[PDB]
């Protein structure tokens, strides 16, 4: 009745992207055919394709194939895909070096033994190279090694890189909707989805809203190609970093930076700058900036600090791209110039101008401030007047701290062993808070989503709902979310501030009852054990607190989503509650959390830091 792991979901990606006019002006006549071709295979054919499309781009064996859930005999199926131009079979596998890599370790030794010439034992690389030398010098023993190694490897397929790229692009276009822009996504793999959203796309029921694009994100067919190209170039650098191939990373990024310097000034790359920030992230320029941002992360890892500093500054000197990141760029720059390069004058310039940037928010803001008080009080600095410098006294108030310690044996303790967060909950349960939610951000986030649902999904803001499978308006993570909905927000926000506990209980029930399960990026439906609990909690928190938290979340979700209190405990009978920031044995309070706790206290909530120490 539906289609497999990969396929029902793939079919959504296809359906969604095809019904999008602007998206379909980005594919030539030929390419669109490749879609109609796909739609015209057997389900079995579609299923096998999806399965393989998701795999690495290389030769894959028929023995290493065995998709029995697809068919008991895959050869009529593979046949169908080859005839359709989607797949290629081994009668086009001619590179001996490829065929050698394709064999197993039992199979290599079979080719190694039945070629007495080769010394039978060794690692895969040791045998492959021996075979490769032997065929270069003597081509007419070479084609004999191929003829046997091919037979021994059996039937084999590889994806036609032609149509692959069409779907890859279709799938990249699908990432604008949904996937990416709750701050820009992983991008890693150069072919497939991220794990979060293949498996579950077909099950998912989305919140209702009115689609209404009016701007063209991509100019002509080639823009999208430059975009795609860039995205992949990013993915690889991400990938290289993940595996600690920093030198590899450095090359890829150096490579990219050159590709970018070549690329600006072009006919297209003005335009994109003048896109609203919430669409500007889907631009070649944005991607490169992200790459360059990673480039600094790399150079830093490779102790190449003057390079990082030159980069950071050049990134900051521009305003168009990734403003949401300057807080980091500044912070990180100050860190370098101080810790590593040990250069005072520029360390202060940095901290000064960084604070003069309205763009640096919350935690990095607070960070730079602290780096400034430490610098002003500093004796090694005192030969001057350089930071008494009219600094709005943004206190880092130490809030109530608490420490705990349990009979230590993953760090497990004795109370019977128990976790670090079990210890923390336990502590509060015996301080008279029977209830508790070990959320970490989402508790609050979902409450806000619950209380502002209709405002979030609101009609009227153009270009924020561009197609079918969106869990948020595209502008949610941008200063513009608030501004574009100002009247409506201020309204509800005040309403909530002056609401009696029953109205809160009501409005939360209202949404819950109308939406329970629709995919909305802010709301975790199972985060509360039931509406009742969610209601109990809003009743403790009360209007003003909920109002405040909501406002920050709406006004600056980008720089406020993080840092919210880890754990929320409360008393069932007395309605007293406490917002706690749990700290395991080997981590500290982030600046973001310091900020959030302070903010919450300003709002009149009981807050607390909790340290758990080793036994």
DSSP 61-83: ESSS---TTT-S--HHHHHHHHH
CB 90 within 8 A of CB 197: no
The residue behind tokens 């919450």 is 600
Instruction: Write the residues followed by a gap in the chain (C–N more than 2.5 A).
Output: 140, 409, 415
CB 466 within 8 A of CB 175: no
- Tell me how far CA of residue 306 lies from CA of 234, 312, 574, 583, in angstroms: 23, 10, 58, 35
Q: Kindly tell me the burial class for residue 36, based on how many C-beta atoms sit within 10 Å of its own C-beta (0-12, 13-18, 19 or more).
A: exposed
Ramachandran category for residue 517: left, alpha or beta (phi over 0 → left; psi -120 to 50 → alpha) = left
Phi, psi of 512 (to 5 degrees): -40, -55
Element housing 541 (H / E): helix 531-560
CB 311 within 8 A of CB 295: yes
HSE of 49, CA atoms in CB hemisphere, 13 A: 31
Count the helix, strand and coil residues of the chain and give each as a percent rounded to the nearest 5: 55, 5, 40
Phi, psi of 437 (to 5 degrees): -135, 115
Residue 393 gets which letter from DSSP?
-
CB 461 within 8 A of CB 474: no
How many C-beta atoms surround the C-beta of residue 46 within 10 A? 23
- Tell me how far CA of residue 345 lies from CA of 221, 335, 369, 556, in angstroms: 49, 14, 17, 32
CB 503 within 8 A of CB 492: no
Q: In terms of Cα–Cα distance, which of 598, 446, 436, 437 is closest to 512?
A: 446
DSSP strand pairing (567-570 vs 401-405): unpaired
Q: Kindly tell me the burial class for residue 169, based on how many C-beta atoms sit within 10 Å of its own C-beta (0-12, 13-18, 19 or more).
A: buried
Phi, psi of 7 (to 5 degrees): -70, -50
Q: Collapsing DSSP states into helix, strand and coil, what is residue 408?
A: coil
What beta strand segments (E) does 287-376 contain? Answer: none
Can you say whether the dihedral through the CA atoms of 510, 516, 518, 523 is positive or negative?
positive
How many C-beta atoms surround the C-beta of residue 27 within 10 A? 20
Residues marked as binding for Mn(2+)?
440, 566, 581-582
Residues marked as binding?
440, 566, 581-582
Q: In terms of Cα–Cα distance, which of 41, 39, 158 is closest to 99?
A: 158
CB 130 within 8 A of CB 119: yes
Phi, psi of 133 (to 5 degrees): -55, -50
- Contacts of residue 310, defined as CB under 8 A and 6 or more positions apart, other chains included, come to none
Element housing 277 (H / E): helix 277-280
For the record, the structure tokens of 243 come out as 């595996």
For the record, the structure tokens of 315 come out as 């990134």
Q: Kindly tell me the burial class for residue 245, based on how many C-beta atoms sit within 10 Å of its own C-beta (0-12, 13-18, 19 or more).
A: middle
Phi, psi of 84 (to 5 degrees): -90, -5
DSSP strand pairing (567-570 vs 577-583): antiparallel
- Tell me how far CA of residue 58 lies from CA of 65, 101, 184, 510, in angstroms: 13, 10, 28, 52
Can you say whether the dihedral through the CA atoms of 584, 586, 592, 598 is positive or negative?
positive
Rounded distance, CA 222 to CA 197, Å? 27
**What is the chain's Cα-based Rg?**
29
Q: Collapsing DSSP states into helix, strand and coil, what is residue 435?
A: strand
Phi, psi of 303 (to 5 degrees): 45, 20
Rounded distance, CA 77 to CA 268, Å? 43
Element housing 553 (H / E): helix 531-560
The residue behind tokens 């009360």 is 542
Rounded distance, CA 401 to CA 583, Å? 10
The residue behind tokens 């079919």 is 11
The secondary structure of 284-305 as a DSSP string is: HHHHHHHHHHHHHHHHHHTT-H
Beta bridge pairs of residue 73: none
Rounded distance, CA 142 to CA 133, Å? 9
- Contacts of residue 204, defined as CB under 8 A and 6 or more positions apart, other chains included, come to 469, 519
Beta bridge pairs of residue 248: none
Residue 176 gets which letter from DSSP?
I
HSE of 7, CA atoms in CB hemisphere, 13 A: 20
Element housing 352 (H / E): helix 344-356
For the record, the structure tokens of 565 come out as 């209190």
Q: How was this structure determined?
A: X-ray
- Contacts of residue 272, defined as CB under 8 A and 6 or more positions apart, other chains included, come to 280, 283, 284, 285, 286
Rounded distance, CA 20 to CA 213, Å? 10
For the record, the structure tokens of 542 come out as 């009360």
Q: In terms of Cα–Cα distance, which of 390, 387, 472 is closest to 177?
A: 472
For the record, the structure tokens of 412 come out as 């497990």
DSSP strand pairing (413-414 vs 417-418): antiparallel
Rounded distance, CA 41 to CA 47, Å? 10
- Contacts of residue 314, defined as CB under 8 A and 6 or more positions apart, other chains included, come to 292
CB 327 within 8 A of CB 364: yes
Element housing 156 (H / E): strand 156-159
- Tell me how far CA of residue 408 lies from CA of 144, 412, 559, in angstroms: 64, 6, 37
Element housing 610 (H / E): strand 607-613
How many C-beta atoms surround the C-beta of residue 173 within 10 A? 26
Beta bridge pairs of residue 414: 417
CB 232 within 8 A of CB 190: yes
Resolution (A): 3.3
Element housing 414 (H / E): strand 413-414
Q: In terms of Cα–Cα distance, which of 400, 446, 456, 433 is closest to 546?
A: 446
Element housing 171 (H / E): helix 161-174
For the record, the structure tokens of 46 come out as 């579609």
Rounded distance, CA 91 to CA 99, Å? 12
Rounded distance, CA 144 to CA 498, Å? 85
CB 488 within 8 A of CB 458: yes
Q: In terms of Cα–Cα distance, which of 518, 467, 387, 476 is closest to 176?
A: 467
b/e burial code for range 591-601 (CB count within 10 A of at least 16 → b): bbbbbbbbbbb
CB < 8 Å & 24+ apart, contacts of 391-399: 391/355, 394/365, 394/366, 394/369, 395/598, 396/366, 396/370, 396/594, 396/598, 397/598, 397/601, 399/597, 399/598, 399/601, 399/607, 399/608, 399/609
Cα 272 to chain centroid distance, Å, stands at 22
């Amino acid at each position: 009745t539906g289609h497999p792991y990969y396929l029902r979901s793939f079919l959504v990606v296809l359906k969604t992207v095809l019904e999008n006019e602007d998206d379909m002006l980005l594919f030539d006549e030929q390419e669109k055919g490749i879609v109609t071709k796909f739609y015209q295979l057997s389900a079995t054919g579609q299923k096998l394709y999806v399965r393989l499309f998701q795999r690495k781009l290389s030769w894959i064996k028929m023995t290493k194939l065995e998709y029995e859930e697809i068919a008991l005999d895959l050869t009529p199926v593979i046949e169908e895909l080859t005839n359709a131009g989607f797949l290629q079979t081994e009668s086009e596998l001619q590179e001996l070096s490829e065929v050698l890599e394709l064999l197993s370790a039992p199979e290599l030794k079979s080719l190694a033994k039945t070629f007495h010439l080769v010394n039978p034992n060794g690692q895969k690389q040791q045998l492959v190279d021996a075979f490769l030398k032997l065929a270069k010098q003597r081509s007419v023993i070479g084609a004999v090694i191929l003829k046997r190694a091919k037979a021994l490897a059996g039937q084999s397929v590889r994806i036609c890189k032609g149509p692959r790229a069409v779907f890859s692009r279709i799938l990249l276009l699908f990432s604008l909707t949904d996937s990416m822009e709750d701050e820009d996504a992983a991008c890693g793999g150069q072919g497939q989805l991220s794990t979060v959203l293949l498996v579950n796309l077909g099950r998912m029921e989305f919140p209702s809203y009115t689609i209404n694009r009016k701007t063209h994100i991509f100019q002509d067919r080639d823009d999208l190609i430059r975009y795609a190209a860039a995205t992949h170039m990013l993915s690889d650098i991400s990938s290289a970093m993940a595996n600690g191939n920093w030198e590899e990373a450095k090359e890829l990024a150096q490579c990219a930076k050159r590709d970018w310097n070549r690329l600006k000034n072009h006919p297209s790359l003005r335009c994109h700058e003048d896109l609203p920030l919430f669409l500007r992230c889907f631009t070649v320029g944005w991607i490169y900036t992200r790459i360059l941002s990673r480039f600094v992360e790399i150079l830093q890892r490779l102790h190449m600090y003057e390079e990082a500093v030159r980069e950071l500054e050049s990134l900051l000197s521009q305003r168009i791209y990734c403003p949401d990141s300057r807080g980091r760029w500044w912070d990180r720059l100050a860190l370098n110039l101080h810790q590593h390069l040990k250069r005072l004058e520029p360390t202060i310039k940095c901290i000064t101008e960084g604070l003069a940037d309205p763009e640096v928010r919350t935690g990095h803001r607070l960070s730079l401030y602290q780096r400034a008080v430490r610098l002003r009080e500093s004796p090694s600095c005192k030969k001057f007047k350089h930071l008494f410098q009219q600094l709005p006294e943004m206190a880092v108030q130490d809030v109530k701290h608490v420490t705990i310690t349990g009979r230590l044996c993953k760090s497990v303790f004795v109370m019977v062993l128990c976790s670090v967060e079990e210890l923390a909950l336990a502590h509060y349960r015996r301080s008279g808070f029977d209830q508790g939610i070990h959320g970490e951000g989402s508790t609050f986030s979902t409450l806000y989503g619950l209380l502002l649902w209709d405002i979030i999904f609101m009609d009227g803001i153009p270009d924020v709902f561009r197609n079918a499978c969106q869990a948020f308006p595209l502008d949610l993570c941008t200063d513009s979310f608030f501004t574009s909905r100002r009247p409506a927000l201020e309204a509800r926000l005040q309403l909530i501030h002056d609401a009696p506990e029953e109205s809160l209980r009501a409005w939360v029930a209202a949404t819950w009852h109308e939406q329970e399960g629709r995919v909305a990026s802010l709301v975790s439906w199972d985060r509360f054990t039931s509406l009742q609990q969610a209601q109990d909690l809003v009743s403790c928190l009360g209007g003003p607190v909920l109002s405040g938290v909501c406002r920050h979340l709406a006004a600056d979700f980008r720089h406020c989503r993080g840092g919210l209190p880890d754990l929320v405990v409360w008393n069932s009978q007395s309605r007293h509650f406490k917002l706690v920031e749990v700290k395991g044995p080997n981590d500290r309070l982030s600046h973001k959390q310091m900020i959030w706790l302070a903010e919450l206290q300003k709002l009149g909530a009981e807050v607390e830091v909790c340290h758990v120490v080793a036994v």
